[PDB]
Amino acid sequence: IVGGYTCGANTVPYQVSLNSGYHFCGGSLINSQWVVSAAHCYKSGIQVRLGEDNINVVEGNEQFISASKSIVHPSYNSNTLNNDIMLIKLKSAASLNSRVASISLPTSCASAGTQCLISGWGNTKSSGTSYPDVLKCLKAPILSDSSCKSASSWIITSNMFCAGYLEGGKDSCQGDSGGPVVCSGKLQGIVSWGSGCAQKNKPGVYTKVCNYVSWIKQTIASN
Ligand SMILES: COC(=O)[C@H](Cc1cccc(C(=N)N)c1)NC(=O)CNS(=O)(=O)c1ccc(C)cc1
Ligand SMILES: [Ca+2]
Numbered sequence: 001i002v003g004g005y006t007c008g009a010n011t012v013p014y015q016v017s018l019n020s021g022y023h024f025c026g027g028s029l030i031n032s033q034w035v036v037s038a039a040h041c042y043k044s045g046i047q048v049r050l051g052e053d054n055i056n057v058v059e060g061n062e063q064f065i066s067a068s069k070s071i072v073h074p075s076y077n078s079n080t081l082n083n084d085i086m087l088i089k090l091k092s093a094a095s096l097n098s099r100v101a102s103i104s105l106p107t108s109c110a111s112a113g114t115q116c117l118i119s120g121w122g123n124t125k126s127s128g129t130s131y132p133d134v135l136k137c138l139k140a141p142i143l144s145d146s147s148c149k150s151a152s153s154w155i156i157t158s159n160m161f162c163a164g165y166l167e168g169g170k171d172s173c174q175g176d177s178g179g180p181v182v183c184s185g186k187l188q189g190i191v192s193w194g195s196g197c198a199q200k201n202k203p204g205v206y207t208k209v210c211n212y213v214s215w216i217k218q219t220i221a222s223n
Contacts, residue, residue, distance in 0.1 A: 001118065002126050002198040003170035004138035009053040010061060012119050012135060014103035014187075015180060017049040018088075019064075026120045026179030028187055029102045032093035034220055035067075037178030038190050038207065039076040039086040046070065048090060051100045054133045055121055061099045065090045071219060073212070082157045084192040084207045086178075087219055105217070106186040109210035112144035116163055116183035118204075120176030120191065126168070126198040131175060138172070140164045142183065143203060151201035159211055161189065164203035172204045173197035181206050 016027040016035055025041035027048065035048055051061035069089040076083045094100055110116070118138045123129050140163045148154070148162035156162065163181060164171050172179065172191045181189030189206035196202060 001120055001122055001136035001138045001176055002124055002173050004124075004136045007119060007135045007137040009059070009134075010051065010099040012137065013099055013101040015052070015119050015135060017052050017055055017121065018178065019047045019049050020045055023055050023121055023175070025177045026191065027088070028180040028190070029094065029100070030105060030187070030216070031102050031220070032096055033090045035088040035090070036187070036190065036216065037086050037088060038192055039072045039084045040078065040081060040192070041178040042070060042072055042086055044070070046088065048088065050094050053135055056133045063094050063100060065092060065094060067091070069223060071223070073215070080155070080157070081193050083159055085190060085209070085212055087216065089223060103180065103182065103187045104185065105213050106188055106210045109208065110142055110183045110188045112142050114142050114183050115139055116142060116181050116188060118163070118172055118176070118179065118181050118191065120172065120179040122176030123173040123197065126196070138170060140170065148203060152195070152203070154205070156205065159208050160192065160205050161208050162203045162205055163189070166201050166203060168198045168200035168202070171198040
């Protein structure tokens with residue numbers, strides 16, 4: 001995360017770290033046995049890590065659970081990243097408590113202008129690289145689709161939304177992929193893509209979760 005702040009140990013209990021010998025993506029615990037992340041974070045042999053703060057030091061609130069099944073969205077398009085979402089099932093249910101809790105799926109979509117909380121262990125520099133060991137937080141508003149398209153001339157699909165600042169300096173970044181975008185206590189988005197990080201007129205694009213609620217609910221009910 002660029003231009004953010006240190007969240008505070010376990011203050012984002014639903015944030016998860018996907019690990020394959022090292023942290024490579026973020027995720028969100030939606031229930032005792034399922035995690036949601038970005039389809040482009042797909043990889044086999046994923047171990048989900050819950051209750052994390054410093055991903056390099058065992059602090060006492062962690063729970064390491066291997067994934068048993070990964071389900072990429074049926075219409076995921078890696079070239080345009082349309083439908084960049086993925087479901088992961090844990091081998092065993094996690095022990096829920098205050099430091100490890102799930103986040104609710106949204107009942108309705110959030111409007112441009114709303115403030116959201118984005119988090120992750122991603123890179124913290126706009127030019128260069130420096131990875132934090134503890135979780136970083138960032139407050140960012142959802143942008144209107146028209147203003148996003150204008151400043152970036154990108155092709156945003158109805159399954160995406162931009163959030164951040166057109167002035168740059170604050171944004172999600174490499175390693176924050178798959179992470180949660182929480183607005184009004186609900187999971188409204190997933191960190192998907194962008195051009196560089198915190199670039200002026202280059203805000204972050206996020207997967208619009210409200211459009212995949214039926215898909216998510218059906219999938220969990222049969223797997
Ligand atoms: C990959 O390395 C990076 O520094 C960021 C990561 C990233 C991930 C998610 C969200 C943000 C964000 N800004 N909010 C950033 N992405 C890029 O810089 C990608 N842009 S890109 O124009 O460099 C590009 C596009 C497509 C391919 C295959 C490779 C590279
Ligand atoms: Ca740890």
